[PDB]
Symmetry: C3
């Protein structure tokens, strides 16, 4: 059937991030006020969810990428995507 | 199964729930005083949503997908309009 | 694959991740000091979530769908309870 998307935004410009899971891969499209562009996030998954929060001016994003029963947390804390501590336990 | 996406704002709060059911996305709304059916009505098998305030004014972006094609819908205070979002997918 | 939904609040932050797996939705929680399994447990194939603060108190709404039926679940400080949400008129 269809791709599966997740979205988050912040500020008043705004900034938007849209994550799309498509045939086992998640990609990211980004808006920061002046056109859509392809983001750095490129990781495996059939399903995606996202949440974000600001600490002052700094955006923090958590992307939950799932393949089968395995969910991997990916963390943006200003400069790159790092693996988070999340487990299903 | 049907598929949903939710957003909220303020502290009343206002809530918007989007449901993709048999190729149509509809919108249910809470503004503190009962659920009602909102103005949003667009095609899609999958839905995500994000929203942000600019002062007291809400801005909403809904991402509606069918197959690998995603269409953005914009609320900026005066009806739903098609957004600039693209994704090759 | 499993289907997830995430929400977060504050600046620590607190995070809740809902996972629909084999018809059941369960919850994992972060409050700054390790992931733990939350109280939430309801039926669903698909899940979305939103949350808002009233003072320091978190309010969470989880939209759980199976077939054509979506149920709203509410956290308001006193345990999970069924919400008034209905999908259609
Ligand atoms: C790998 C690890 O465990 N990192 C810790 C940070 O935890 C990450 O972020 C939190 C919110 C959850 O998503 C975790 O599952 C995830 O691993 C943790 O908290 C965060 O540190 C970030 C810098 O790494 C950043 O400062 C962020 O503001 C903060 O929320 C920190 C502090 O407890 O410890 C890391 O080890
Ligand atoms: C039935 C209808 O169309 N009512 C209008 C309100 O529209 C609803 O809410 C908006 C945000 C969309 O989700 C619509 O599709 C939905 O029908 C509309 O919205 C108001 O937004 C305020 C904040 O900017 C505030 O949260 C308020 O609770 C909400 O009602 C208003 C104002 O644009 O017009 C009504 O006609
Ligand atoms: C408001 C708050 O954060 N409450 C935490 C307890 O509940 C968790 O968080 C809330 C918002 C919901 O997401 C719940 O589903 C989630 O479990 C949390 O867990 C509760 O503690 C109880 C006794 O201390 C009891 O063990 C219960 O089973 C457990 O669900 C506790 C962690 O101990 O922190 C609260 O802050």
């Amino acid at each position: 059937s269809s791709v599966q998307t997740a979205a988050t935004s912040w500020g008043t410009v705004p900034s938007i991030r849209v994550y799309t899971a498509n045939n086992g891969k998640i990609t990211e499209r980004c808006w920061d006020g002046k056109g859509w562009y392809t983001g750095a996030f490129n990781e495996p998954g059939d399903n995606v969810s996202v949440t974000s929060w600001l600490v002052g001016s700094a955006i923090h994003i958590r992307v939950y990428a799932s393949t089968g029963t395995t969910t991997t947390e990916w963390c943006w804390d200003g400069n790159g995507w790092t693996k988070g501590a999340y487990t299903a336990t």
